């Protein structure tokens, strides 16, 4: 790998600089190099990995949605324009799939198997569900159902651990539940499960806020608002 | 080149799709492929080329400024942090220089020499001044003065043609004058020349607005406002 000659600490330092410069592709490459050093990631380092790839894939998903919509309209009274829209949508789609496969590969070799604490294991399993979810958004062929089930299975294992090992206000647990609820609504055609999950998560967090410091209260209530935003949109 | 097998029309079509998807690196690559087909560019195609590269280099310049500022602070009571900030600033700088060299290469081979109409020749010479200006922003060594003079010379030839062949409200002429005034203020250490140029350009355009249609009036007054914005900032 092209980061093989750079010190782990320097990769982390440069990932933080790339974040400040909004250079998320660089940030992701630096964090991939850091993961490939083979040592486990601290909490801050895990967040850097997630921020980098979420931003890279988020731009790819936004572009794919623009191009997919143009492609949809072209296939309605619409004039034939040739293969270009499909080709370019496919190009962006293949790039997106490549990023998802890269992230999933880092999780499989070997972040998840070395993650023993609940906070790291839940974090990585949530990421696995997220990146299979992004693959599912663009899937159409023989493995769409298997891709969806891979996302479900990762989210489910993360939920089981998070419920047993974390308080209901833990921001990792809240963000996992938020994303699993989105999976239910957007991927699994299960809006009732999505609503039930978001509501139960919100209510159980509400009841636990009294145990928190002012700073933790701020952290948890911010994610609760994201759950509330979805419930308002979905109900 | 990787676009050598794609039709010129398909490259143009995909450049427009990439713009809609805010995929400016792709847009630039498509427009580079279109230029390399060897045919002259229409007015719309010239604008696509400029939009693509302006957005790519604009992101690089913003990142370089962030990293340069961090580097400045590190060299003031500041703790020694190693070579990483300089290395990463250099990496972004080298990428930026590569983009500028790519654009300048397309202008030199062979867009400028085939551009005979004032509107195309002024457009390309303005681009030449712009991309030498971006090189000058990061230059420090033996050729900084020669880089600055290359920007000046391109802008000056574009100004001479634009003054002889275009009305003072022409949006190309206005945008050239805007950028040459920025060159004077930011690159050539000539704020009085920058102010004089912006003011004279604004006033000569004002006096010509009566000749324009409603749509052309809108086009010209928008760029005049950019000149006014700079004058307000600089005076
Ligand atoms: Ca080492
Ligand atoms: Ca028709
Ligand atoms: Ca052809
Ligand atoms: Ca100190
Ligand atoms: Mg290396
Ligand atoms: Mg119901
Ligand atoms: Mg090709
Ligand atoms: Mg004075």
Residue numbers in the entry:
A (entry chain A), B (entry chain A): -4 to 71, 73 to 231
Recite the paper's sentences.
The 14-3-3σ protein, which has multiple interacting partners with specific peptidic motifs, was used as a case study. We have observed this phenomenon first-hand with human 14-3-3σ, a protein which has several hundred known interacting partners in the cell. Furthermore, different isoforms of the 14-3-3 protein are function-specific. For example, the 14-3-3σ isoform (but not other isoforms) specifically targets p53 and is associated with tumour suppression, making it invaluable to determine crystal structures of the target peptide with the correct isoform.
